[model samples]
Target: GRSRLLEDFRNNRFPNLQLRDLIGHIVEFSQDQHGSRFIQQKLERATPAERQIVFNEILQAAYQLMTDVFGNYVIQKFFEFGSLDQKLALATRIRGHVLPLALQMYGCRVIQKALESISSDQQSEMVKELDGHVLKCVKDQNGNHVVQKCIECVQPQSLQFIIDAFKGQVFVLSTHPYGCRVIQRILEHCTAEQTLPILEELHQHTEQLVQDQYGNYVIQHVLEHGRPEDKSKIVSEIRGKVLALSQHKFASNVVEKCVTHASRAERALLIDEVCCQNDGPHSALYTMMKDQYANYVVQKMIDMAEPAQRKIIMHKIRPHITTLRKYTYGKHILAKLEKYYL
Candidate 1:
């Protein structure tokens, strides 16, 4: 297999090798550590004649090269600089193999780049291949990312199938490590009609989700970007459980989001709960001002509260200054109290 040319190139046997000379050897040569880097550098700088010759060999072994360690980057390079016809031809080679490619380490990246560069028609075809395997992709570290790329770059109309796959599995996915991330993407990208049931499931499990390691993220995202009714509903769920939720490891994060973004009326109610307890020895502010995680919520209220309400909160927290200083996380709250005292 006349591989001395490639062998020499890899071992620096060919000192003056050019991109045009690698034509027939392009596929196998691209798998070489040095050869891969050389072609990519040259491909970006190639003349139209040089590119067409190189891509002919690339299409011959596109699948093998996509999964090849160094060869994968070569395919990705063409998508980056290849002409519309060149990129479309590369996409044609992607048919029937989208799932395998989407799940493979090297191949997954190729899938992502194609999504970013290909036309909508080709984009829908590639993304559609993953429809039945959506969960598998959602659960995989490699495939999960491709799914996210699909969401981030694909048209919302074409993503209806993705949203459809998630019909009743929203809660199960929310709690999943990788699934949670995809859920975040869906919430951010899927249409309102598509995401309504997803939101419904998240709200249905509010108490459990806020305390979940991954689920809390979904709730926090909704607070940040979801519609008003959605935000209000989450705030409404946290109504009487402010202290318990704030002291929690994961739930504490969602609590802070709620405090900062909730409606002014709802924000007042959340702050009211702890302030009312401030007079007691074990009051909500008293506990949160000294506790590890809840202290953040206390600081958030101080920053978010209107002057009159903040005055009362500051008055209530002043009681815990000495004890608050002793707790590790409490110092953060202490700094704020000091900042506002003047």
Candidate 2:
């Protein structure tokens, strides 16, 4: 800032020859140093008045840098080519020498709107660069922002490299609403083999993150959408993790769908699986006992439940408990119900 402002004012105030020689040295200084710390050391060489003018121009430039399209382009390139050290230095230098003046322009509403658009484009370009440097971004010591921005860019744009750069960083991304949207997009684009683990990791967090935003529609989509084999595979994976939970809330959400709509055979099979006559969410048993119109599930549970579970099952079926006795196997059913809920 100090250097650039001085150069600018000199160009306007002095003869062209004197200004050219001075500006030439400024360019050489940046190129040679690759770091700008050395420039501040030279500030002492200028008069108090020159320093004051330098200060004013630096402030003006900084204000424009944040709002003017040309200034924004320059800031973008600075991030593009400069080393980390150089970028931070220049940003800090601009902030220190120019922030007070620039901030007065902060309330400039038109400029504010323009800055918002620039921020979006700035994030977009960072995303593009991160995509190009995918491997490096993954391995970069300070890759967090790159990975995060890449995740953001994936939704509005179909960039596979950004997804790849975000590899293990999926945990970071998947936790946010926008991040989940990106994961869904990646699943759409990446091959099944590639997307599987990503889905697996997402499944691991589903119980924690599943929202009621789409309610039953999301659950139905989860349960019934996708390729047959893919759907089966995903359900089985979900079941394994879901059954491991002490509470079956998420698993029961799926069970409600089957209870509400699956055909008799499908419901029967699901009830059998729920009771561990096969393998599935035990809440299926819970749902069977509780669902008011689901007699099929209720009977399937009575047939499959253990003596103890049958008692709870019978008690749960208070109004229909005697219906068990109407079947020809009445004695056996009566004895179990009598031994339990009765």
Candidate 3:
């Protein structure tokens, strides 16, 4: 039964010398789950001449193939394994379709593959095709990733177009789930000079970003990669707000990042802010040690603090040991105290 199906598909009626011999049905094969694999296998093992023939046929069908679920993989494989001419030909076919391709779930990946495999000039042309649409693309769910991939692979001249599109929207983008990732990619791949304006824009919104769900990560990334002055600017945003931030689900992370990135004097101020006693029976440190989220921040503070600093936390925590051991979140803090502070 198995041999019969294989013979019928390959040899019985539509006999193929090699899978490449089935190139007449390239479109059909591109759509078949099993046939697509056979096509990819043929491309992977095909000689130069045979590979050219396969790509020549596929590039003509690039638009149709890219939108198909199984066909998209075959098109992606062409980008992965095809010659420079073949890759460029595919790029040319989909030249003006960047916006449409990017918004499509399957086409978005094919567009990304082209960016990865195409040449600089070709990549720039593709980036240029989206010139007025960069912002639109950046905000789209699937399109944003394509924009990011361009940042990762395109030249600075091309990247500037995307940056210029941001205008003063850096802060707005920094807070978006998709846009935040693109901003981080820019920081990582672009020159410091290129990102300076962006960092400055973000500085204006440091307070809002430090507390935002997605924006906080962009702030943390800036702390890691930004200039000392920029880092200090962000650290200052969290300076007097340490205790409140440490208890936040997201801001607590930004608070921890502030601790790791702060100066010696700034670091001292931050530690004191969280560990300092309040007027109630539960000091900030005592309450945080029992917080579902803030407990980790407290433990991090203790781990980073000097012996004298840790002593302050230990003193605050010791009074609640018996009570902490009985509470779910507090027991973890009690265990850490025994391991490091005791």
What value does the lDDT take at residue 74 in candidate 2?
33
Better of 1 and 3 by TM-score: 1
For every candidate in turn, the CA RMSD to the true structure comes to 2.0, 16.9, 3.3
Positional deviation of 178 in candidate 1, in angstroms? 1.1
lDDT of each: 0.88, 0.42, 0.81
Candidate 2 backbone collisions, by pair: none
Residues 29-101, candidate 1: write the lDDT tens digits.
Answer: 7898878999999988989989899999889899999999999999999899999999988888888999999
Q: How do the predictions measure up, each by TM-score?
A: 0.94, 0.34, 0.90
| TM-score: model 1 vs. ground truth | 0.94
Best by lDDT: 1
- How far in Å is the alpha carbon of 69 misplaced in model 1? 1.6
Mark the regions of model 1 whose C-alpha exceeds 4 Å error after superposition.
1-3, 12-16, 278-280
Q: Per-residue CA lDDT of candidate 2, range 1-342, in tens? A: 356645564355533322223443433233222212233333335454443333333333443544443234333433444344534444444333231222233212222222233345443433453334544433333343334334443334545556555656655555543444445545554556566566565555454433333232333344443444444443443343332321344444544444334444444444445455323533433434433433333444465544555555455445554544455444454555566534
Q: Extract clashing residue pairs from model 1.
A: 8-13
How many pairs of residues collide in each model?
1, 0, 0
Ranking by TM-score: 1, 3, 2
